[PDB]
């Protein structure tokens, strides 16, 4: 049930450790630039993140070991506005035993995996999933 801890660099070179996000809900995505689901769902995530960032939900979109350039090109094409990290050796992918691409893990403020999602997600499902993990209620 507990999300394995990991440390990866984001696309700006910043160290991101999962446990440094305790107290927040984490929408943890594993994805590749070629994935039909990701091309569709990344824009929905980016629109939802505009609302949920200020409700204590963080997104960590773990790319499965593709190049910096391929990742950058995808992020620009799909308007990504949330943290993307590079699982350069697929170590984290292996720790989470991820099969289909993509896979999403809903992690609560305590670091517990509350749902694993491999199906297609509408923007509404993404909204409800972020609600499922946000730390209580935050005032406007």
Describe the structure.
The radius of gyration is 14 Å and the shape is globular. With 140 residues, it is of the alpha/beta class. It has one domain: Glutaredoxin (3-Layer(aba) Sandwich). The N and C termini lie far apart (32 Å). The longest helix is centred in the N-terminal third of the chain and has 17 residues. Helix content is 31%, strand content 24%.
How does the SSE layout of this entry go?
Layout: E1 7-9, E2 15-17, E3 25-31, H1 36-52, E4 57-63, H2 68-77, E5 84-86, H3 91-95, E6 103-107, E7 113-117, H4 123-133
Parallel strand pairs: 3-4, 4-5
Antiparallel strand pairs: 1-2, 3-6, 6-7
Helix pairs in contact: 1-4
- Trace the largest sheet across and list its strands: 5-4-3-6-7
Structural class: alpha/beta
- Gross morphology is globular
Radius of gyration: 14 Å
Number of helices: 4
Strand fraction equals 15-25%
PDB class: oxidoreductase
Keywords: Thioredoxin-like fold, Cytochrome c-type biogenesis, Membrane, Oxidoreductase, Redox-active center, Signal-anchor, Transmembrane
Assembly: monomeric
Entry title: Structure of a ResA variant with a DsbA-like active site motif (CPHC)
Short description:
This protein has helices at 36-52, 68-77, 91-95, 123-133; strands at residues 7-9, 15-17, 25-31, 57-63, 84-86, 103-107, 113-117. By secondary structure, it is an alpha/beta fold. The relative contact order is 0.25.
